[PDB]
Amino acid sequence: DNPIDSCWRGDSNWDQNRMKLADCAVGFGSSTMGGKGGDFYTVTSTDDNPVNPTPGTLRYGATREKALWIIFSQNMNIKLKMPLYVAGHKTIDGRGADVHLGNGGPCLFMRKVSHVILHSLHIHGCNTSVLGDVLVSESIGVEPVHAQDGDAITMRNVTNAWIDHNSLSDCSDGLIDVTLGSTGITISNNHFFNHHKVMLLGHDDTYDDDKSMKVTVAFNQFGPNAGQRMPRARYGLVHVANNNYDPWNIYAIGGSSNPTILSEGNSFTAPSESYKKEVTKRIGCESPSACANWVWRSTRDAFINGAYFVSSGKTEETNIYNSNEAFKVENGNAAPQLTKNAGVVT
């Protein structure tokens, strides 16, 4: 499979050992524990009461202060009534069921929390929410939440989070939004498809405190019919490794305000159009001379149908991970094989 999946699918049956998953994260979110150590929590109901969630529902388990490993008793299409804020030390684990979130309602939000694993969920059709009260968490209580974008997954001031093996498509705004000082995150093994604006890492050209953001994007399937922002980064550092890209609509990888982008072992298949062959897109350059300072590297990438990556900065060996984070990246010709199981586990 790949270095992540090999760790919990090689000599383990996940159904009888679900928390082994938490030992297998790589990249900057490798310290993510999720609800490891906590109790298992089973979702038995599809209901949602935003201000007073009841036992058995997704929002009740997701808002508890204690560590919980959330699983689902049956296939479920869940339509939330308000943004779901997920507390820290939580895993939402869709293995063993067909779980679909969104469906015209708002989706998943994390704000000022750590140690969250989101795994093997389908999220699609997320929509703009309405201003209103919400139980942010058991400990925080009910608070007004402004109207939010229809993003599938939103992280604000989050550290140590792992988004893995989800199937993410067709939302009104973004699929993954990472902002405001978030860092220590791995986004891996996901399938992103049928969606224009995929992934935003750093939200404004104003917020330079995102300079400390570190994010790993690995073993994802981007497409078909994914438009752009895969990722779009600002200010911080993103390692984009062993992902597989179908033809994009505008560009594949881009950014503004001097992000560091380390592209390694990706496979890029360009659309037919001449003006869409370039994988990269720099936004907001002050001058070619200035934009030439940004360190955007392409290492052992593979290019199909005329795709190309415009590099900037000098060549160097990837040296960004400690021993708890490091993992092997293969040549881009291997990316289709390494991503064959992207998306939910079955």
From Swiss-Prot:
Ca(2+) binds at D149, D173, D177. Binds 1 Ca(2+) ion. The active site is at R229. Disulfide bonds join C7-C24, C107-C126, C285-C291. Expressed in pollen (at protein level). GO terms for biological process: pectin catabolic process. N-glycosylated; consists of complex-type N-glycans containing the Lewis a antigen (Galbeta1-3(Fucalpha1-4)GlcNAcbeta1-). Residues 71-83, 230-237 are annotated as: IgE-binding. Binds to IgE in 5 out of 7 patients tested. Belongs to the polysaccharide lyase 1 family. Amb a subfamily. Has low pectate lyase activity. This is Pectate lyase 1.
